[PDB]
Amino acid sequence: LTPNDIHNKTFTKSFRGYDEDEVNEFLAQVRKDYEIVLRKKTELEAKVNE
Amino acid sequence: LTPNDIHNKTFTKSFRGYDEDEVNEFLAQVRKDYEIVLRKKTELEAKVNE
């Protein structure tokens, strides 16, 4: 998965499904922390190279 | 977040919510991908430390 795949991700509507705003809030936290690790990995690859 | 935080997260239910199975399956995929990138980042840091 890429951060773009997480961004604004939606799911099928369901009665008594998980609350939409709480799931969308949580996916903003997941997207942020996944992009933090991917950016660090990019940084460390470049240091390896140099 | 840690990968296990993503598995452990709960959400309240709503009249119009998101399908639980679809959310849980997506978060299982993000957890697995996140734990792999964290491992790769940790390996790279060691390759930079060495």
Side-chain angles (χ1 to χ4, degrees):
Chain A
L1 284 166
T2 68
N4 284 165
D5 294 323
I6 304 161
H7 188 252
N8 286 9
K9 172 74 185 190
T10 71
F11 306 90
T12 294
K13 298 171 220 225
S14 185
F15 175 59
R16 307 190 189 280
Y18 296 143
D19 191 271
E20 292 162 335
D21 290 341
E22 293 171 19
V23 172
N24 291 165
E25 182 172 353
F26 184 67
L27 290 178
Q29 182 76 227
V30 170
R31 184 194 171 213
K32 172 188 169 195
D33 287 335
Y34 195 40
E35 178 183 70
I36 282 169
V37 67
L38 283 166
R39 103 117 98 129
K40 181 69 198 228
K41 170 169 188 296
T42 293
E43 190 177 339
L44 289 162
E45 280 161 343
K47 269 249 167 226
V48 166
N49 267 47
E50 156 266 47
Chain B
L1 292 163
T2 68
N4 285 352
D5 289 327
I6 294 172
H7 183 63
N8 295 155
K9 186 64 177 179
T10 64
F11 309 99
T12 66
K13 312 302 182 295
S14 290
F15 189 94
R16 188 192 69 208
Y18 289 141
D19 185 82
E20 300 146 73
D21 291 328
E22 299 189 359
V23 170
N24 290 154
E25 285 177 18
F26 182 69
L27 293 178
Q29 194 190 166
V30 181
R31 174 194 184 202
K32 286 189 185 101
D33 287 349
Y34 188 47
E35 185 167 80
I36 288 157
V37 65
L38 288 169
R39 198 214 321 107
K40 289 180 189 185
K41 183 271 302 194
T42 289
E43 281 161 6
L44 278 158
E45 291 228 283
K47 176 156 68 317
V48 174
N49 290 335
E50 145 72 26

